[PDB]
Amino acid sequence: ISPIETVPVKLKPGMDGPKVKQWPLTEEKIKALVEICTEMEKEGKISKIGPENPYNTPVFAIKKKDSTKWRKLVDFRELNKRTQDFWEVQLGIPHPAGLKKKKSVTVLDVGDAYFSVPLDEDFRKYTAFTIPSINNETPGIRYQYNVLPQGWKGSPAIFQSSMTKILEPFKKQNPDIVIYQYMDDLYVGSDLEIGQHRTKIEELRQHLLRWGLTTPDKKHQKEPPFLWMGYELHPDKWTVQPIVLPEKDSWTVNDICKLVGKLNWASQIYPGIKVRQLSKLLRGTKALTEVIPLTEEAELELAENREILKEPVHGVYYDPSKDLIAEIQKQGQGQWTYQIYQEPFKNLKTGKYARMRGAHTNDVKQLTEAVQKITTESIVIWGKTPKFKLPIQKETWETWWTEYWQATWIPEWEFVNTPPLVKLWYQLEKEPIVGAETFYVDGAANRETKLGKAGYVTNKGRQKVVPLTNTTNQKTELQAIYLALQDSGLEVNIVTDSQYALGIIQAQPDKSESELVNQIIEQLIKKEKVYLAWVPAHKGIGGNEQVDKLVSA
Amino acid sequence: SPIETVPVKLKPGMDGPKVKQWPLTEEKIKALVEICTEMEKEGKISKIGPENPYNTPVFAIKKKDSTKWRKLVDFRELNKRTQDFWEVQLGIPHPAGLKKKKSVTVLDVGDAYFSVPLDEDFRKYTAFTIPSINNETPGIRYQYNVLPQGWKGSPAIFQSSMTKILEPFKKQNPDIVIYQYMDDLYVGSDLEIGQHRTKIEELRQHLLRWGLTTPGYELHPDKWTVQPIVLPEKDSWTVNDIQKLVGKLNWASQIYPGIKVRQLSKLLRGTKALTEVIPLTEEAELELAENREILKEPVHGVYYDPSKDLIAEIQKQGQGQWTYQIYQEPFKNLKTGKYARMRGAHTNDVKQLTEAVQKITTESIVIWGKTPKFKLPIQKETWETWWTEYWQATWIPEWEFVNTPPLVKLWYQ
DNA sequence: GCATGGCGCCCGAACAGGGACTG
DNA sequence: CAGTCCCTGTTCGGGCGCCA
Ligand SMILES: Cc1cn([C@H]2C[C@H](N=[N+]=[N-])[C@@H](COP(=O)(O)OP(=O)(O)OP(=O)(O)OP(=O)(O)OC[C@H]3O[C@@H](n4cnc5c(N)ncnc54)[C@H](O)[C@@H]3O)O2)c(=O)[nH]c1=O
Ligand SMILES: [Mg+2]
Ligand SMILES: [Mg+2]
């Protein structure tokens, strides 16, 4: 029974305890479960309860890593609804790439960790449960937890929290030891003599026992191939644990999830990973079991990546004396890849970034987003933002940030040549083009019928109007600009009362999710001098007027 | 110091703050660790567990000439929900004279609040969590035991003591104005700059007699110009120019009702060419100048309304210039300025905007003793990533992000 | 009638806000 | 002026990955 002081817990005002009945279990389960409760009973983890306790919560079991034994869980879902909130302390997950090299290293793990911290007394009642007989022919036995149960939303937090308080004393008196605690999984590293270390490890392992924390000898002792957080930490490198992709003929939705999930975990270190085609399959709303025909474009990816994982890589460690560099490359349309290293090819961590934000953007923008993403992620791992090497010319960027209306910025970065390169695919003109047919575009639709017209009317005399089906006053506006762009030469002067359209265009987008806007872009690339100007909408302006009367019959 | 803590009531039915903490650079994590462990020993704060559902983010900043770091908590939230308490019940008056003084300086008396203890029940709401690099460890949680800095309540509870502390100074120098905005103290006078600085220094000492550590910076409310909109002066007018012009006039027309343009409109009549030059007609010349006069005379209908939220907009110009407008309702500007190419700021659009924002927030405090809500012209993740590296004030304004291309170029610049 | 906390990625629904149009 | 639309951005839930 642990001396560690318990943490006061209450339920939400007006809510009583859980009164949900136990659902029947399987023969083997009821079998293992009773072997467990018996052992907990004696140890003092749980307690046999009288009939005066009106509560109950269904319980069940699940096999562990090597499938020797079982894990007793409790479906405290109803209890989590009623119980008080907590504020979580685990803010993130440690990364091997942020690990430093150390003379000696060890990694322990507290056995049965939850079952060694005292649950607040008053709360225990609500944690009551029942275990049936073999075939439910004799009333079962009521029990309640006196320790942290598995399935209560408060556990992980209380535990993690109680653990740091126990390690606080030891960590202060040993400022020279670095310890990474994640739940009950400890990693102790030091630059102490190989033997002195083993002494601290003993001095420590014996510190937990004093606080009730067991330390089974089943732990990485002077074992270079350390298994921490699903990684293989070697003396001067680190890798991820064997990563096996699902291999099957017919794929269901869920199957693909379980496939992309893993490929992302891979991107952490395997470079060049891409999952854009693969996930596209997940569009629309579909069931986990809905079987979906693997597409052609995705078949390329699913295979491409599979070729990448065939040839294993490894990660290196970090040292504070050298700055960090993160180089990035543009992998597909919308996709990007990046690797952070401290030396030439000495990689410390790789990564993918593929969120195509917004309806319309451009490589510069999507690039800027990636730098930001990496900048942040690196501050979490190393607490300092790294140096960049980006595939974009210094003059390109400088052309963009001065012209763009939003404030924008990229930290310390040098150039790197590796196609494809980022660049603006065109540039509207600052001043009107001399000696050029000027198009006065506009359009409109009757939002009540979806019918609509789009057209232009030039100074030279040109003129046209096109009827449209299923369109809106905004789309129309665009459509119109499309026409004026087609029916023009390499130099053009277009004018519109469309703040919307003008909005998109000026941002120099090079990709979009809009058919129409994709075509406009394409056409804009083909010209040599474009110039769009804006005028008030239903003013009597010169040319606008006319096209207006035309488009709205 | 055993004292009777004023009870802090909360907005009825208000849930305390629950904000996640954000990543922190190594240098500012180690600064925060140091800062907090001494605060823990000095008893200002107390360690706590995960049983306290609340939370507010923390970070830290190093200001000008101060090598010592300063802790800063974003009680931006806990302030919106305790507003009843500090604006109504224990409100503190705003002198409308300060905006008129020849010189004003800002002192950091925030330290002084650490003296008074905080009401036991309200402590759980000031909870904060310190992160660890590479998540070597879970978050360490702390809560305040004394008036913290950053909460709008603190300067409201300490007003009684402040009145006193400053009573003898207001007597000997009945011609200076003191205003207390949160962690700040704003002292304004019409004295000459060299002696003004000394009155500030006799005041700093005056605060020393009670134990308050008061660690281009002087302000000048009289030198702040509300620069208006102006129309260009061209020799020959192109069709394009006359267009853009109307574009602006029709727009600026929502401001003043007098601007007419129907006379400048008849000029474009008929699909012409953009580069086509057009003779400057007299029907226009009259009305053009006619409008040019309306835009000089100050807009009629301006008025401040304490009962309404203040709003600031900034436009990015280029070459380091920025323009802003503070208002409560569309087209009824209270003031509009033009932040210039700050001599010393790097070519960092974000570092610049960050600076502009703090100027506005400051001007805003002096003029109406209230902070504005900003409409920043930058993308959230872009700003969210670097705004803290450049911040140097002790308060944080409520901002929202907006993206809106430039119609009629920028009428304001 | 098959649990909990954390972080990541990806997709979509719900929601909010500004400009243009409509009666 | 107030009520509809359309377009768009931001938030939050659910599912998978990985850890405990
Ligand atoms: C996996 C899991 C964890 N948890 C919560 C509650 C749980 N505490 N408890 N009880 C705590 C830690 O779980 P852990 O898996 O460490 O088990 P626990 O702390 O319960 O006890 P113990 O560690 O003794 O677990 P066993 O399954 O009995 O032993 C397996 C352990 O032995 C070590 N081990 C065995 N063989 C080796 C080897 N060759 N090399 C290195 N380590 C080894 C290894 O760390 C593994 O966890 O996280 C949860 O809520 N749900 C889950 O599904
Ligand atoms: Mg364990
Ligand atoms: Mg129109």
Side-chain angles (χ1 to χ4, degrees), chain A residues 380-410:
Chain A
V380 189
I381 298 163
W382 304 293
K384 48 185 277 197
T385 154
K387 292 193 179 64
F388 290 88
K389 294 183 176 312
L390 329 165
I392 161 176
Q393 295 171 295
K394 289 159 69 172
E395 196 52 58
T396 306
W397 175 257
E398 176 178 41
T399 280
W400 169 250
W401 74 265
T402 58
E403 306 298 59
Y404 196 30
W405 56 86
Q406 309 271 294
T408 186
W409 187 64
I410 306 296

mmCIF file of all heavy atoms in Angstrom, chain A residues 380-410:
data_model
loop_
_atom_site.group_PDB
_atom_site.id
_atom_site.type_symbol
_atom_site.label_atom_id
_atom_site.label_comp_id
_atom_site.label_asym_id
_atom_site.label_seq_id
_atom_site.Cartn_x
_atom_site.Cartn_y
_atom_site.Cartn_z
ATOM 1 N N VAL A 380 10.140 22.111 -30.671
ATOM 2 C CA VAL A 380 9.672 21.177 -29.680
ATOM 3 C C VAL A 380 10.772 20.184 -29.421
ATOM 4 O O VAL A 380 11.047 19.853 -28.299
ATOM 5 C CB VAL A 380 8.411 20.381 -30.122
ATOM 6 C CG1 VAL A 380 7.872 19.594 -28.952
ATOM 7 C CG2 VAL A 380 7.318 21.302 -30.595
ATOM 8 N N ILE A 381 11.425 19.701 -30.455
ATOM 9 C CA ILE A 381 12.465 18.712 -30.235
ATOM 10 C C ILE A 381 13.734 19.279 -29.692
ATOM 11 O O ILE A 381 14.290 18.728 -28.761
ATOM 12 C CB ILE A 381 12.812 17.972 -31.541
ATOM 13 C CG1 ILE A 381 11.583 17.229 -32.045
ATOM 14 C CG2 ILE A 381 13.934 16.978 -31.308
ATOM 15 C CD1 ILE A 381 11.677 16.830 -33.442
ATOM 16 N N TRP A 382 14.197 20.372 -30.275
ATOM 17 C CA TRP A 382 15.449 20.961 -29.851
ATOM 18 C C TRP A 382 15.344 22.337 -29.169
ATOM 19 O O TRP A 382 16.319 22.850 -28.585
ATOM 20 C CB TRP A 382 16.400 21.019 -31.051
ATOM 21 C CG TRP A 382 16.626 19.683 -31.682
ATOM 22 C CD1 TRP A 382 17.270 18.595 -31.135
ATOM 23 C CD2 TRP A 382 16.102 19.250 -32.918
ATOM 24 N NE1 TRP A 382 17.157 17.517 -31.958
ATOM 25 C CE2 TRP A 382 16.441 17.896 -33.062
ATOM 26 C CE3 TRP A 382 15.370 19.874 -33.924
ATOM 27 C CZ2 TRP A 382 16.071 17.167 -34.162
ATOM 28 C CZ3 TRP A 382 15.002 19.149 -35.021
ATOM 29 C CH2 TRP A 382 15.348 17.816 -35.137
ATOM 30 N N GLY A 383 14.173 22.949 -29.236
ATOM 31 C CA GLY A 383 14.032 24.219 -28.572
ATOM 32 C C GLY A 383 14.750 25.361 -29.230
ATOM 33 O O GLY A 383 15.006 26.379 -28.591
ATOM 34 N N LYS A 384 15.066 25.205 -30.503
ATOM 35 C CA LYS A 384 15.709 26.265 -31.248
ATOM 36 C C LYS A 384 15.287 26.053 -32.679
ATOM 37 O O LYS A 384 15.135 24.925 -33.084
ATOM 38 C CB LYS A 384 17.226 26.176 -31.108
ATOM 39 C CG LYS A 384 17.774 24.834 -31.334
ATOM 40 C CD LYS A 384 19.276 24.786 -31.071
ATOM 41 C CE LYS A 384 20.123 25.265 -32.280
ATOM 42 N NZ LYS A 384 21.587 24.854 -32.208
ATOM 43 N N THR A 385 15.049 27.117 -33.439
ATOM 44 C CA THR A 385 14.663 26.958 -34.834
ATOM 45 C C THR A 385 15.948 26.809 -35.667
ATOM 46 O O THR A 385 16.924 27.505 -35.442
ATOM 47 C CB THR A 385 13.786 28.151 -35.299
ATOM 48 O OG1 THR A 385 13.929 28.319 -36.711
ATOM 49 C CG2 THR A 385 14.163 29.438 -34.588
ATOM 50 N N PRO A 386 15.965 25.888 -36.637
ATOM 51 C CA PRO A 386 17.091 25.571 -37.529
ATOM 52 C C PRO A 386 17.275 26.437 -38.750
ATOM 53 O O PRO A 386 16.411 27.233 -39.080
ATOM 54 C CB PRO A 386 16.770 24.170 -37.952
ATOM 55 C CG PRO A 386 15.311 24.349 -38.246
ATOM 56 C CD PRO A 386 14.801 25.073 -37.003
ATOM 57 N N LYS A 387 18.398 26.242 -39.436
ATOM 58 C CA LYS A 387 18.713 26.976 -40.666
ATOM 59 C C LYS A 387 18.068 26.263 -41.857
ATOM 60 O O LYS A 387 18.016 25.029 -41.904
ATOM 61 C CB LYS A 387 20.213 27.033 -40.889
ATOM 62 C CG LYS A 387 20.983 27.877 -39.895
ATOM 63 C CD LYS A 387 22.403 28.120 -40.419
ATOM 64 C CE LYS A 387 23.198 28.967 -39.483
ATOM 65 N NZ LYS A 387 23.366 28.242 -38.198
ATOM 66 N N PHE A 388 17.591 27.019 -42.833
ATOM 67 C CA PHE A 388 16.929 26.385 -43.962
ATOM 68 C C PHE A 388 17.681 26.464 -45.268
ATOM 69 O O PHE A 388 18.462 27.387 -45.497
ATOM 70 C CB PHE A 388 15.546 27.012 -44.189
ATOM 71 C CG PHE A 388 14.530 26.679 -43.128
ATOM 72 C CD1 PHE A 388 14.415 27.457 -42.001
ATOM 73 C CD2 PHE A 388 13.710 25.593 -43.262
ATOM 74 C CE1 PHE A 388 13.513 27.159 -41.044
ATOM 75 C CE2 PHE A 388 12.803 25.299 -42.294
ATOM 76 C CZ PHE A 388 12.707 26.087 -41.184
ATOM 77 N N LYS A 389 17.416 25.482 -46.128
ATOM 78 C CA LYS A 389 17.973 25.416 -47.471
ATOM 79 C C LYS A 389 16.716 25.116 -48.276
ATOM 80 O O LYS A 389 16.194 24.008 -48.209
ATOM 81 C CB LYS A 389 18.962 24.273 -47.572
ATOM 82 C CG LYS A 389 20.207 24.467 -46.719
ATOM 83 C CD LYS A 389 21.203 23.320 -46.927
ATOM 84 C CE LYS A 389 22.477 23.575 -46.144
ATOM 85 N NZ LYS A 389 22.981 24.972 -46.356
ATOM 86 N N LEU A 390 16.214 26.106 -49.009
ATOM 87 C CA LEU A 390 14.969 25.951 -49.769
ATOM 88 C C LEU A 390 15.145 26.085 -51.273
ATOM 89 O O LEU A 390 15.919 26.905 -51.744
ATOM 90 C CB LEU A 390 13.959 27.005 -49.318
ATOM 91 C CG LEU A 390 14.025 27.460 -47.856
ATOM 92 C CD1 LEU A 390 13.233 28.745 -47.689
ATOM 93 C CD2 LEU A 390 13.526 26.344 -46.942
ATOM 94 N N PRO A 391 14.393 25.315 -52.049
ATOM 95 C CA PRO A 391 14.442 25.315 -53.508
ATOM 96 C C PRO A 391 13.719 26.487 -54.131
ATOM 97 O O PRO A 391 12.787 26.314 -54.910
ATOM 98 C CB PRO A 391 13.768 24.017 -53.853
ATOM 99 C CG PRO A 391 12.685 23.985 -52.841
ATOM 100 C CD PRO A 391 13.398 24.358 -51.565
ATOM 101 N N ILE A 392 14.152 27.687 -53.795
ATOM 102 C CA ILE A 392 13.541 28.894 -54.335
ATOM 103 C C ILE A 392 14.590 30.005 -54.406
ATOM 104 O O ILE A 392 15.339 30.227 -53.468
ATOM 105 C CB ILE A 392 12.340 29.332 -53.452
ATOM 106 C CG1 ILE A 392 11.991 30.793 -53.712
ATOM 107 C CG2 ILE A 392 12.673 29.156 -51.981
ATOM 108 C CD1 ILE A 392 10.790 31.225 -52.960
ATOM 109 N N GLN A 393 14.649 30.704 -55.522
ATOM 110 C CA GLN A 393 15.645 31.756 -55.661
ATOM 111 C C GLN A 393 15.373 32.943 -54.776
ATOM 112 O O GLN A 393 14.229 33.364 -54.647
ATOM 113 C CB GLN A 393 15.737 32.213 -57.117
ATOM 114 C CG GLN A 393 16.249 31.120 -58.065
ATOM 115 C CD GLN A 393 16.139 31.499 -59.529
ATOM 116 O OE1 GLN A 393 15.034 31.667 -60.066
ATOM 117 N NE2 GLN A 393 17.292 31.628 -60.186
ATOM 118 N N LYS A 394 16.439 33.473 -54.175
ATOM 119 C CA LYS A 394 16.352 34.630 -53.288
ATOM 120 C C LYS A 394 15.616 35.803 -53.923
ATOM 121 O O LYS A 394 14.950 36.567 -53.233
ATOM 122 C CB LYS A 394 17.750 35.071 -52.855
ATOM 123 C CG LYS A 394 18.392 34.103 -51.886
ATOM 124 C CD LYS A 394 19.935 34.215 -51.821
ATOM 125 C CE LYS A 394 20.442 35.532 -51.176
ATOM 126 N NZ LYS A 394 21.931 35.547 -50.951
ATOM 127 N N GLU A 395 15.719 35.951 -55.236
ATOM 128 C CA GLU A 395 15.031 37.057 -55.867
ATOM 129 C C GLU A 395 13.552 36.714 -56.044
ATOM 130 O O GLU A 395 12.688 37.587 -56.072
ATOM 131 C CB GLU A 395 15.693 37.412 -57.205
ATOM 132 C CG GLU A 395 15.282 38.797 -57.768
ATOM 133 C CD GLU A 395 15.452 40.009 -56.760
ATOM 134 O OE1 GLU A 395 16.587 40.262 -56.264
ATOM 135 O OE2 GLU A 395 14.447 40.730 -56.471
ATOM 136 N N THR A 396 13.244 35.433 -56.145
ATOM 137 C CA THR A 396 11.850 35.051 -56.303
ATOM 138 C C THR A 396 11.131 35.515 -55.053
ATOM 139 O O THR A 396 10.223 36.339 -55.116
ATOM 140 C CB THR A 396 11.681 33.530 -56.439
ATOM 141 O OG1 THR A 396 12.518 33.055 -57.489
ATOM 142 C CG2 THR A 396 10.263 33.187 -56.803
ATOM 143 N N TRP A 397 11.567 34.987 -53.916
ATOM 144 C CA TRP A 397 10.983 35.312 -52.628
ATOM 145 C C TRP A 397 10.869 36.819 -52.446
ATOM 146 O O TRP A 397 9.798 37.337 -52.145
ATOM 147 C CB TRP A 397 11.827 34.690 -51.507
ATOM 148 C CG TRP A 397 11.383 35.059 -50.163
ATOM 149 C CD1 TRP A 397 11.959 35.962 -49.344
ATOM 150 C CD2 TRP A 397 10.180 34.642 -49.520
ATOM 151 N NE1 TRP A 397 11.187 36.156 -48.230
ATOM 152 C CE2 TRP A 397 10.086 35.352 -48.314
ATOM 153 C CE3 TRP A 397 9.166 33.739 -49.852
ATOM 154 C CZ2 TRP A 397 9.020 35.191 -47.434
ATOM 155 C CZ3 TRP A 397 8.109 33.578 -48.979
ATOM 156 C CH2 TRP A 397 8.044 34.299 -47.784
ATOM 157 N N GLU A 398 11.966 37.529 -52.659
ATOM 158 C CA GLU A 398 11.963 38.968 -52.482
ATOM 159 C C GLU A 398 10.953 39.627 -53.398
ATOM 160 O O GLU A 398 10.473 40.713 -53.122
ATOM 161 C CB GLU A 398 13.360 39.518 -52.726
ATOM 162 C CG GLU A 398 13.454 41.013 -52.663
ATOM 163 C CD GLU A 398 14.883 41.516 -52.860
ATOM 164 O OE1 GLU A 398 15.594 40.960 -53.743
ATOM 165 O OE2 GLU A 398 15.290 42.473 -52.143
ATOM 166 N N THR A 399 10.618 38.971 -54.496
ATOM 167 C CA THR A 399 9.634 39.527 -55.415
ATOM 168 C C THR A 399 8.259 39.358 -54.799
ATOM 169 O O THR A 399 7.387 40.218 -54.928
ATOM 170 C CB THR A 399 9.655 38.792 -56.770
ATOM 171 O OG1 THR A 399 10.740 39.298 -57.556
ATOM 172 C CG2 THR A 399 8.332 38.968 -57.521
ATOM 173 N N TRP A 400 8.081 38.247 -54.102
ATOM 174 C CA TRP A 400 6.816 37.928 -53.480
ATOM 175 C C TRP A 400 6.459 38.716 -52.253
ATOM 176 O O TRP A 400 5.404 39.358 -52.212
ATOM 177 C CB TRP A 400 6.784 36.461 -53.144
ATOM 178 C CG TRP A 400 5.671 36.077 -52.299
ATOM 179 C CD1 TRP A 400 5.751 35.690 -51.030
ATOM 180 C CD2 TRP A 400 4.310 35.898 -52.691
ATOM 181 N NE1 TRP A 400 4.539 35.254 -50.581
ATOM 182 C CE2 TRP A 400 3.630 35.370 -51.586
ATOM 183 C CE3 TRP A 400 3.603 36.128 -53.869
ATOM 184 C CZ2 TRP A 400 2.275 35.056 -51.609
ATOM 185 C CZ3 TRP A 400 2.240 35.818 -53.901
ATOM 186 C CH2 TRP A 400 1.594 35.285 -52.770
ATOM 187 N N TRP A 401 7.331 38.693 -51.254
ATOM 188 C CA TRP A 401 7.007 39.390 -50.011
ATOM 189 C C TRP A 401 6.841 40.886 -50.093
ATOM 190 O O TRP A 401 6.161 41.490 -49.269
ATOM 191 C CB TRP A 401 7.983 39.032 -48.882
ATOM 192 C CG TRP A 401 9.322 39.608 -48.943
ATOM 193 C CD1 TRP A 401 10.429 39.031 -49.469
ATOM 194 C CD2 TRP A 401 9.743 40.833 -48.337
ATOM 195 N NE1 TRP A 401 11.534 39.812 -49.218
ATOM 196 C CE2 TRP A 401 11.142 40.927 -48.526
ATOM 197 C CE3 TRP A 401 9.075 41.859 -47.650
ATOM 198 C CZ2 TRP A 401 11.892 42.007 -48.052
ATOM 199 C CZ3 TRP A 401 9.813 42.930 -47.179
ATOM 200 C CH2 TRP A 401 11.214 42.995 -47.383
ATOM 201 N N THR A 402 7.445 41.497 -51.089
ATOM 202 C CA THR A 402 7.269 42.926 -51.216
ATOM 203 C C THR A 402 5.937 43.215 -51.893
ATOM 204 O O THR A 402 5.279 44.196 -51.592
ATOM 205 C CB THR A 402 8.355 43.532 -52.060
ATOM 206 O OG1 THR A 402 8.353 42.903 -53.346
ATOM 207 C CG2 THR A 402 9.698 43.348 -51.368
ATOM 208 N N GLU A 403 5.541 42.329 -52.797
ATOM 209 C CA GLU A 403 4.309 42.502 -53.547
ATOM 210 C C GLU A 403 3.062 42.005 -52.840
ATOM 211 O O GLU A 403 1.989 42.591 -53.002
ATOM 212 C CB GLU A 403 4.432 41.806 -54.912
ATOM 213 C CG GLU A 403 5.647 42.233 -55.742
ATOM 214 C CD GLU A 403 5.652 43.712 -56.125
ATOM 215 O OE1 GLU A 403 5.622 44.583 -55.216
ATOM 216 O OE2 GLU A 403 5.696 43.995 -57.343
ATOM 217 N N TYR A 404 3.190 40.925 -52.074
ATOM 218 C CA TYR A 404 2.037 40.364 -51.373
ATOM 219 C C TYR A 404 1.525 41.309 -50.284
ATOM 220 O O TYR A 404 2.313 41.938 -49.587
ATOM 221 C CB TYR A 404 2.390 39.010 -50.770
ATOM 222 C CG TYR A 404 1.177 38.200 -50.357
ATOM 223 C CD1 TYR A 404 -0.040 38.327 -51.029
ATOM 224 C CD2 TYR A 404 1.269 37.243 -49.343
ATOM 225 C CE1 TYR A 404 -1.124 37.520 -50.706
ATOM 226 C CE2 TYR A 404 0.190 36.423 -49.013
ATOM 227 C CZ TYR A 404 -1.005 36.561 -49.696
ATOM 228 O OH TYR A 404 -2.053 35.710 -49.380
ATOM 229 N N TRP A 405 0.206 41.398 -50.131
ATOM 230 C CA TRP A 405 -0.371 42.304 -49.148
ATOM 231 C C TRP A 405 -0.339 41.838 -47.722
ATOM 232 O O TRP A 405 -0.542 42.631 -46.821
ATOM 233 C CB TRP A 405 -1.804 42.645 -49.514
ATOM 234 C CG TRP A 405 -2.626 41.469 -49.673
ATOM 235 C CD1 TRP A 405 -3.298 40.797 -48.694
ATOM 236 C CD2 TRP A 405 -2.914 40.796 -50.899
ATOM 237 N NE1 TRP A 405 -4.004 39.741 -49.238
ATOM 238 C CE2 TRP A 405 -3.784 39.718 -50.592
ATOM 239 C CE3 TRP A 405 -2.523 40.998 -52.234
ATOM 240 C CZ2 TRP A 405 -4.275 38.844 -51.580
ATOM 241 C CZ3 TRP A 405 -3.008 40.132 -53.216
ATOM 242 C CH2 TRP A 405 -3.877 39.067 -52.884
ATOM 243 N N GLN A 406 -0.103 40.558 -47.500
ATOM 244 C CA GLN A 406 -0.044 40.044 -46.137
ATOM 245 C C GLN A 406 1.406 40.060 -45.689
ATOM 246 O O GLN A 406 2.318 39.936 -46.500
ATOM 247 C CB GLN A 406 -0.562 38.611 -46.075
ATOM 248 C CG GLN A 406 -1.923 38.408 -46.718
ATOM 249 C CD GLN A 406 -3.060 38.641 -45.752
ATOM 250 O OE1 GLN A 406 -3.222 37.881 -44.784
ATOM 251 N NE2 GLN A 406 -3.862 39.699 -45.997
ATOM 252 N N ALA A 407 1.624 40.226 -44.393
ATOM 253 C CA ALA A 407 2.982 40.239 -43.852
ATOM 254 C C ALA A 407 3.466 38.818 -43.920
ATOM 255 O O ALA A 407 2.752 37.915 -43.517
ATOM 256 C CB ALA A 407 2.964 40.698 -42.406
ATOM 257 N N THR A 408 4.669 38.596 -44.417
ATOM 258 C CA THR A 408 5.145 37.224 -44.503
ATOM 259 C C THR A 408 6.629 37.181 -44.249
ATOM 260 O O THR A 408 7.310 38.181 -44.443
ATOM 261 C CB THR A 408 4.833 36.623 -45.890
ATOM 262 O OG1 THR A 408 5.181 35.235 -45.922
ATOM 263 C CG2 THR A 408 5.588 37.355 -46.945
ATOM 264 N N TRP A 409 7.136 36.022 -43.826
ATOM 265 C CA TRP A 409 8.550 35.901 -43.501
ATOM 266 C C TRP A 409 9.082 34.479 -43.420
ATOM 267 O O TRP A 409 8.354 33.553 -43.079
ATOM 268 C CB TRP A 409 8.813 36.584 -42.167
ATOM 269 C CG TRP A 409 10.233 36.669 -41.827
ATOM 270 C CD1 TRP A 409 11.195 37.357 -42.501
ATOM 271 C CD2 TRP A 409 10.879 36.056 -40.724
ATOM 272 N NE1 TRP A 409 12.419 37.210 -41.878
ATOM 273 C CE2 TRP A 409 12.247 36.411 -40.783
ATOM 274 C CE3 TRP A 409 10.438 35.239 -39.682
ATOM 275 C CZ2 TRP A 409 13.172 35.976 -39.852
ATOM 276 C CZ3 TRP A 409 11.361 34.802 -38.745
ATOM 277 C CH2 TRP A 409 12.718 35.172 -38.839
ATOM 278 N N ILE A 410 10.371 34.335 -43.724
ATOM 279 C CA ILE A 410 11.079 33.067 -43.697
ATOM 280 C C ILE A 410 12.380 33.349 -42.952
ATOM 281 O O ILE A 410 13.092 34.295 -43.271
ATOM 282 C CB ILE A 410 11.440 32.587 -45.123
ATOM 283 C CG1 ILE A 410 10.216 32.536 -46.036
ATOM 284 C CG2 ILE A 410 12.010 31.191 -45.046
ATOM 285 C CD1 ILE A 410 9.155 31.529 -45.615
#
